[PDB]
Design a protein around this ligand. Structure first.
Ligand code: SF4
Ligand code: F3S
Length: 106
């Protein structure tokens, strides 16, 4: 499975969803997650993220390990997203800010 980590939060560019062959991204207010059962690990999304927030599960940084289980849990509750849309309004002010998990909205 590929995992969306911290830098997506409050950026949510959604470029990633274009390339997904199996449509396994699920949408929240200011973050996207990948559904781990559905992902086929084709890796096509992680060059597409502007925020470089997508990682192969086995490459998630040590200090972002929480995101693996978070993607798994929120994918079960959030709606599927299959079309790219506009980035959040202030997405590049937040692109690169560390510690954005405290801003996640359910
Ligand atoms: S690795 Fe492939 S299947 Fe998994 S979320 Fe990315 S594009 Fe979709
Ligand atoms: S910012 Fe998030 S919405 Fe997709 S393009 Fe990157 S994982």
């Amino acid at each position: 499975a590929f995992v969306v980590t911290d830098n997506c939060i409050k950026c949510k560019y959604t470029d990633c969803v274009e390339v997904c062959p199996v449509d396994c991204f699920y949408e929240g207010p200011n973050f996207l997650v990948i559904h781990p059962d559905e992902c086929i690990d084709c890796a096509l999304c992680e060059p597409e993220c502007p925020a470089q927030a997508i990682f192969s599960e086995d490459e998630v940084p040590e200090d972002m390990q929480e995101f693996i289980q978070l993607n798994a849990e929120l994918a079960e509750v959030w709606p599927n997203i299959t079309e790219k849309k506009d980035p959040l309004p202030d997405a590049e002010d937040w692109d690169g800010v560390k510690g954005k998990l405290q801003h996640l909205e359910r």
